[PDB]
Amino acid sequence: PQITLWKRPLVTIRIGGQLKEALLDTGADDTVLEEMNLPGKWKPKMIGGIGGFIKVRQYDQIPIEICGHKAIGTVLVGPTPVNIIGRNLLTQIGCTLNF
Amino acid sequence: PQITLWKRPLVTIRIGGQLKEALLDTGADDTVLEEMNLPGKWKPKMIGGIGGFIKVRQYDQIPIEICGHKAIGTVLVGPTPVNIIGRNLLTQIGCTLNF
Ligand SMILES: CC[C@H](C)CN(C[C@@H](O)[C@H](Cc1ccccc1)NC(=O)OCCNC(=O)C(Cl)Cl)S(=O)(=O)c1ccc(OC)cc1
Structure with a gap:
């Protein structure tokens, strides 16, 4: 599909058995989801943007479906104000910018 | 062009007659540039990101050439980690997401 801006x-994304709304975000290197209690091992990480840094939990090889396209990779979980689909998964679903 | 992720x-962008590098950022409503001088009046504003809020200078109706395409619109100037081109100008240059 084509999504105007x-x-x-x-x-709509599907992860860890939940459906959620998330931003397709070309400005995001990594994928950052709102706090959710996912099972499995994780690693601490800090990520930064406007305002400063937040603490997140890094989970790897997590299956996630984005607008009906399957992907699998790293998801960062923490107190982000919005669910963010970053380039690590955007590439997997063949997403490009076009003008 | 078509840009993969x-x-x-x-x-590269041209603004106030100077060249800069900027990130095409679909997750940003607004365009936010690192501290710089721009001509004309500005308004004090605040803008949010993943780590909280920052103070910016809002410049309206500013011409900017983005990868060879003309836009004229609002530019926020402040302590962003990176120059970001947000949706307010991505729409002007006819940018869409495709997958
Ligand atoms: C300063 C931008 C920065 C380079 C990347 N940001 C992604 C942006 O698209 C960000 C997404 C976002 C949107 C709404 C709330 C929180 C994060 N957008 C952004 O910072 O917009 C800045 C101006 N704000 C607005 O236009 C409105 Cl949406 Cl508040 S981010 O969320 O901080 C981020 C995301 C992933 C990441 O992985 C390393 C590191 C940072």
């Missing part, structure tokens, strides 16, 4: 590019 | 979508 008049509004926030929010799509 | 294995690397950061960095492009």
Whole structure:
């Protein structure tokens, strides 16, 4: 599909058995999801943007479906204000920018 | 062009007559540039990101050439980690996401 940018590019994702709305975010290196109690091992990480850094939990090889396209990779979980799909998964679903 | 996402979508922009590198950032509503001088009046504003809020200078109706495409719109100037081109200008240059 083609998604214009008049509004926030929010799509439905499926992860850890939950459906959520998330931003398709070309500005994000990594994928960052709102706090959720995922099972498995994780590693601490800090990620930074406007305002400063937040503490997140890094989970690897997590299956995630984005707008009906399957992907699997690293997901960062913590107190982000919005669910963010980053380039690590955008590449997996063949997402490009076009103008 | 069509831009894939294995690397950061960095492009050259021209603004206030000077060249800079900036990130095409679909997760950003607004365009935020690192501290710089721009001509004309500005308004004090605040803007949010993943780590909290920052103070910015809002410049309206500013021309900016982004990877060879003209836009004229609002530019926020402040302590962003990276120059980011947000949706307000991505729409002007006809940018969409495709997968
Ligand atoms: C300063 C941008 C920075 C280079 C990347 N950011 C991704 C942006 O697209 C960010 C997404 C976001 C949107 C809304 C709330 C929180 C994060 N957007 C952003 O910072 O917009 C800045 C101006 N704000 C606005 O336009 C509105 Cl949406 Cl508040 S991010 O969320 O901080 C981020 C995401 C992933 C990541 O992995 C390393 C590291 C940082």
